[PDB]
């Protein structure tokens with residue numbers, strides 16, 4: 001409720017800018033990110049994001065690549081999926097884990113066609129209210145990615161990042177903590193590029209700020225990372241870490257390419 005929040009706008013702005021520019025240059029190339037950014041029809045775009053999200057929920061990225069492409073190949077739109085049989089879905093789903101998520105995705109498409117005029121609802125709340133199995137996270141991913149709605153989202157990856165960035169050590173499954181992370185995400189989400197921001201936060205968690213041995217030296221957000229600052233302060237305190245020192249013994253002043261140490265070049269030792 002203090003040092004665990006983003007008190008100054010300037011900092012929010014720096015977090016957004018660093019994360020997004022890192023993302024624009026380092027993000028992995030994934031078929032759903034490509035499809036989504038290239039699709040100009042919002043209903044097809046939202047469906048494409050929806051499928052990838054359901055697929056990613058119970059399975060690793062590496063395997064979703066294989067299935068995602070084949071799935072969209074066969075059913076590139078809500079309408080196409082709406083008229084597939086249960087048996088066809090099972091075959092295309094085989095290897096993605098719990099089948100019901102897949103059956104539920106197809107029944108979702110069918111509901112959109114038969115009760116909603118084929119239109120994907122355009123807001124996170126509306127998307128959560130209407131589509132079966134679509135929770136707060138998936139609704140937010142579709143709305144921010146497909147529609148540009150400024151809604152922040154928190155999955156495991158973002159949670160790991162935010163817990164470190166604001167040094168939150170309380171049990172994350174706690175209700176107070178979840179609500180705090182969601183609050184942070186909602187405050188951080190970039191109003192102009194909320195989709196990329198969400199994808200960037202997740203990507204950071206998946207690539208740089210990993211469960212183990214995180215790549216803090218390559219992290220675009222190291223400066224604003226409360227956990228990082230703390231370990232840096234400890235590392236200095238653990239070694240004896242302490243702007244020329246020999247020089248204070250001046251009058252006539254010695255040279256300004258640092259005195260030696262080194263001591264690199266033909267100089268020294270001049271007893």
Ligand code: SF4
Nearest residue numbers: 164209216219222225
């Ligand atoms: S500096 Fe390290 S702990 Fe902090 S956000 Fe980056 S990867 Fe995570």
